[PDB]
Each structure stands twice: as structure tokens, then as C-alpha cells.
Amino acid sequence: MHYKAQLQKLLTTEEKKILARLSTPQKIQDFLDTIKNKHTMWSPRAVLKHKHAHCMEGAMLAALALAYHGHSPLLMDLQTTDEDEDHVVALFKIDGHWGAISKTNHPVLRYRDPIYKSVRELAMSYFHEYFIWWTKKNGGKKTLRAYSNPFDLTRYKPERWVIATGDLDWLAEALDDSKHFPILNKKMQKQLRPASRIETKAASLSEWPKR
């Protein structure tokens, strides 16, 4: 309630009217679906203004909306080899089970229903669909290597990220530097099989055109 009070001090009437509607994790994901998928690392304020977001911008807005209704604003980092880019989601729980809100342009690394018994279990549900699909060089290689502990944005003064103008590279870097848990050892990595051609083709589909 205290955290929510701090948020209300920072937000305009329009912002609060939006956040008030987004009262369930499902409603939040529905809202992110209407934002155009994509320089900089916008605040939730900027995202609501310009209605454009990459993954971490999407997750930060989700975390804000979750916090506005009394959930912890939690991020999880999905960390890849240098061949790929990391992905960030907003974690949530309902009746003891983990779910995830996700902003992505492709049919992989999507929303997760609150049915996963642990962070690990949820994270593992992404592994098989995190692969190189955009080039033939290591075509189909599975690139996920680690997941973060839930990253609680409560540790910061909300001004620092909710309404920031300053570009939040520091926040991205803090997330990347937090505790991560490896998914493989060296033996397991050697076992990995590439995704099939049908899988890479499917992953390549786009929600929003690359205009």
C-alpha cells in the first residue's frame, strides 16, 4: 500500500486510469499485445506515451501494473551465449504458482500461465524455443544458458525507473549482474541438438512489420 502510494504521487491521471484497468496478469498481457514491438531503454511513462516497447520496456511496464495492484514488481533475465540477445519477463504468482508476462514480436518466449511450481520450472519451459533462426550460421543452435533470481524493483526509489527520462541502461546492467543459475554443464551442452528447419521458419514470423 505504501509502495502504491509512492507510485500514485508520481503518475498522471491518464497513467493511473490505465493501470487501474490492468488488474490481472492476463489483462496486463492483453494490454502489451496492443503496444507496437520495436537507441534507448524507455521508462513505463515513455512506453505509455509512445505505445512502443522492446522486451525489457514491456516487462518494466508489466511490473509497474502488477505493483499498482499489489504484486511485487519482479523481473527475470534469460541469459544466452554471445550469439543471441537476453530476454526479460515480469514474473507473477497466483495461488503459489509462477507465471510470466512477456513482450516479444515472435511466436516464442511468450506469456506463461501461473501453473509452474518453481522459477526453474518456468525458465525451463523457454529453453527449447530459444534458438538462432535469423541466419544459417549456427542455424537452429539453442542459446539459453542461465536465468536470474526474481529481480525486485522495490529495492530502488520508484522515481528512478517509473518516470525516468535518463535512459535506464544502469537498470539493465544491474539485472545482468544479479545472481543467475546455469541450466547446463559442459557435458550437457555437448549433447544439444539444433532446432529443425520447420521450427526456425515458425520462429521467424512477426507480429509487427519491420517497417
Add this chain to the structure above:
Amino acid sequence: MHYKAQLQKLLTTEEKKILARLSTPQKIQDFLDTIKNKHTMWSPRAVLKHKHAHCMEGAMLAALALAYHGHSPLLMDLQTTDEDEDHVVALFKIDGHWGAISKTNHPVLRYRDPIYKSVRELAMSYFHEYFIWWTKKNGGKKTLRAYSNPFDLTRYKPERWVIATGDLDWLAEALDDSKHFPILNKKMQKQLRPASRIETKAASLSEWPKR
């Protein structure tokens, strides 16, 4: 070794030459990739003859090839609502971790690398990608509800399935009747969100044409 001996008594020279090559789970999956995806429920013999298979025909051949190299021939049933069809995979383990060999025509319910710490964890990696994609009626509804214990085909005389002529509906029925574990309760089911339009479109892609 005893089980393998029984298999060798039943198999032709050609059959054994094939099974001898398929010495890793990865090699087996590669082989199933060359079989055309699809009445009846053919034996591994029939599948090797006609080079055509649905999911359970694929999994039984996989289980045979696994057994020929000393693994348990294990099946896992993935059980859906009445709106969908069940799917069967062949489970395997390498260094204490579960993987799965799978025969499917679509970019979902595919192979799983041996990295999953439990049957449950592996089964849960399929949940989000098991949905209605072929009609608008309950379009995108997530239909997986339970997974079986590993089903060891060792319980039967190998003649009964490896080289059967008789159509193996009884084997399918025995699998469906084995111990299953629910994934949801009624509360969780009410939380479920439909897959997106981009997801149903991606799932609809076909490896083999529907000629």
C-alpha cells in the same frame, strides 16, 4: 542384453542394420525426420517397411531403437481434453536427465534434449504449445491436462508389438489406462489464457504436405 537377444531373433538383417546405426537418441530423432508423417497402428516393422508414421508409431520405433542399444523402451502419454488428440513420446535419460523423442508434423511437441531434471519438468515444457490451432471454435485453447508415468514396453513379449501384424489398439488403450498425473486443478484451469493468433498460425505449419 537378454531383451536385445529376443529382439535379434525377431528382426531381419535389414532391420538390424538400421537399428545398429541409430546408436544415440539424436540419431534416432534424425531418422524419424526422414519418415513421412501421416485406419491402423503399425508395428516398428511396418513403419520401417512403408516409411510412414503417426506419433505413437514413431515413438514405438524410437523405443525399439533405444532398446537395441540398451535403454528401456519407455513411452509417455500426453493427455488432453476431448477437444484435442493425445500425443505420445519416447522418453530417454543421459547422465540422470530426461529427454524425449517425438514424431510430429507441426513445429510444436518436438524433441527434448536430455536436460530435464524430472518427468514432470519435461512434461511441463510441452504445456504452453498444446493448443487448438485448426479451428476458430475455442481457437487457441490450451488442452493438455495430464502426463503418464513412463510406460515400459518390457512388460510385454516383444513379438506382441515389435513385429505385430494385428494392429496395436490394445497397446494404445493400455497406455491410456496407465497411471496419469494431472497438471491443473479446477482453479488453475479457470486462469488459463488462449494462445495468440501468431502462435496458432505458427503451429499450423506442416513438415509434410497433406496430399
